[PDB]
Amino acid sequence: LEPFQKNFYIESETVSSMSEMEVEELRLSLDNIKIKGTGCPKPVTKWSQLGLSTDTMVLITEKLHFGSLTPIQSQALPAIMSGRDVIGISKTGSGKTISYLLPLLRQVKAQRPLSKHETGPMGLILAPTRELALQIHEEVTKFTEADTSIRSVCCTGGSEMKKQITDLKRGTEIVVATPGRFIDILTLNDGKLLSTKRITFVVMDEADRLFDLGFEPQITQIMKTVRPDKQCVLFSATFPNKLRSFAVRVLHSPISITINSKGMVNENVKQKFRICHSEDEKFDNLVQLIHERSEFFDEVQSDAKAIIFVSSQNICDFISKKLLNAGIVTCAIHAGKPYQERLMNLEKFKREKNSILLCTEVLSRGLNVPEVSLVIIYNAVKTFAQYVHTTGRTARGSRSGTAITLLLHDELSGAYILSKAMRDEEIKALDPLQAKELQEMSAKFESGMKK
Numbered sequence: 227l228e229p230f231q232k233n234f235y236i237e238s239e240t241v242s243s244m245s246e247m248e249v250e251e252l253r254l255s256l257d258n259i260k261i262k263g264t265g266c267p268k269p270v271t272k273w274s275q276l277g278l279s280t281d282t283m284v285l286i287t288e289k290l291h292f293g294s295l296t297p298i299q300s301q302a303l304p305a306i307m308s309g310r311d312v313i314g315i316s317k318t319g320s321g322k323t324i325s326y327l328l329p330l331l332r333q334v335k336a337q338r339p340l341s342k343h344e345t346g347p348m349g350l351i352l353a354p355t356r357e358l359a360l361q362i363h364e365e366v367t368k369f370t371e372a373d374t375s376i377r378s379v380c381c382t383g384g385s386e387m388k389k390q391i392t393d394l395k396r397g398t399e400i401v402v403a404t405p406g407r408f409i410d411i412l413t414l415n416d417g418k419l420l421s422t423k424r425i426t427f428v429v430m431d432e433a434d435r436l437f438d439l440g441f442e443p444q445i446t447q448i449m450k451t452v453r454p455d456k457q458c459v460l461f462s463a464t465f466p467n468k469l470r471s472f473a474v475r476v477l478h479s480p481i482s483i484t485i486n487s488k489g490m491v492n493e494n495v496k497q498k499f500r501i502c503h504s505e506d507e508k509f510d511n512l513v514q515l516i517h518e519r520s521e522f523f524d525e526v527q528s529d530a531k532a533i534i535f536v537s538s539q540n541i542c543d544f545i546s547k548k549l550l551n552a553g554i555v556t557c558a559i560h561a562g563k564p565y566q567e568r569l570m571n572l573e574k575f576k577r578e579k580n581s582i583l584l585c586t587e588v589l590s591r592g593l594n595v596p597e598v599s600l601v602i603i604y605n606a607v608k609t610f611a612q613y614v615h616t617t618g619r620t621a622r623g624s625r626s627g628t629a630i631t632l633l634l635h636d637e638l639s640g641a642y643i644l645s646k647a648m649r650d651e652e653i654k655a656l657d658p659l660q661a662k663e664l665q666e667m668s669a670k671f672e673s674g675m676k677k
């Protein structure tokens with residue numbers, strides 16, 4: 227019942243100044259960060275936005291040379307440092323260790339040191355295997371080497387547990403342990419060797435594996451004995467129902483952070499693109515797509531509408547007229563038409579069988595049209611939010627249709643977005659060449675950015 231500080235995070239002015247629209251775009255760009263729970267702070271983008279110690283900043287930026295945070299770090303660090311229970315779900319190799327380690331270190335460092343009668347630890351990291359525990363312990367050691375105030379001990383079934391004990395005799399601030407082994411240590415020396423009294427921070431790492439390998443009973447037993455108001459975090463590559471059930475029971479008002487759990491675009495949407503080398507070739511492709519649609523219609527005839535999004539009023543006027551020369555009728559809408567003429571076009575589009583709407587991307591914001599069978603993005607969009615909003619005009623659950631982007635060969639940010647928004651399955655099903663050109667473009671954008 228001794229009071230302890232859990233909430234340390236002071237949001238930097240740079241992050242505070244970020245608008246909610248900017249945060250949404252940032253979360254999309256960081257491998258589709260999705261949050262559940264209330265009061266999650268904005269994600270950070272620099273190590274310097276976190277109030278880390280000078281020494282930690284040196285290790286991270288000058289010895290490990292980390293230049294950017296992973297998505298799970300960007301969002302999990304501020305949330306955990308704000309004292310919240312957090313569930314973090316992110317693919318293997320995405321930096322989950324540091325995501326919990328830096329906040330653990332901060333909380334532990336802030337507390338009253340162990341008195342001579344206190345065994346520790348203050349922090350507990352549970353891992354499903356000896357090998358994993360040892361790895362975590364290595365990281366903990368690295369980040370605590372320069373600081374005498376924090377010791378770590380790795381408690382596993384590692385050859386000489388006898389070499390683990392003698393160490394525990396001296397006390398420790400952090401224990402990294404497999405769950406069965408931790409419980410065993412709790413009974414040694416009449417329960418006087420290692421105590422849970424001062425545990426304020428618990429981490430469950432590789433938590434799906436903690437459960438698969440049969441540790442739920444041990445972990446339940448551990449949670450029941452740690453103080454109820456502990457901070458607890460759970461990190462894992464997957465989040466099966468049984469683990470969720472455990473998490474919900476055991477965590478207090480947790481924040482859930484998932485990194486690319488589902489597609490930012492509805493999975494039923496068929497995403498496509500065509501790379502063109504000039505506006506002329508782009509228009510030729512548009513006409514061809516429209517012709518292929520019409521052929522399909524006859525074939526089917528043994529109401530599927532389309533929207534073409536363009537960037538500007540001028541391009542809208544221009545394409546409407548060119549399509550008409552090619553014998554293609556459209557309803558066009560852009561801010562240069564009076565309100566009545568826009569309504570007229572909307573109602574015509576809705577009323578007419580297999581109609582085509584030509585619309586500027588900004589008129590699409592407040593667009594009163596039902597979802598459609600086909601979206602053609604004539605001018606490739608350059609943000610994730612625009613791409614999700616535009617392709618979303620064909621998202622209709624199981625009855626979703628097709629979204630096609632006409633991409634110029636120098637539209638590197640457009641390629642980058644496609645490369646991240648399309649499904650892995652879609653990218654894999656691409657013709658080797660298409661996939662090659664897309665990746666090169668994406669790569670070019672990526673390098674061009676940092677450099």
Ligand SMILES: Nc1ncnc2c1ncn2[C@@H]1O[C@H](COP(=O)(O)OP(=O)(O)O)[C@@H](O)[C@H]1O
Nearest residue numbers: 292293294295296317318319320321322323324
């Ligand atoms: N921001 C970062 N930039 C570069 N490398 C990182 C970053 N964060 C972590 N790493 C490194 O990436 C590797 C995998 O990190 P880890 O925490 O083991 O991933 P996970 O736990 O998600 O599988 C490790 O070598 C780790 O030190």
Ligand SMILES: [Mg+2]
Nearest residue numbers: 322323431432
């Ligand atoms: Mg890990």
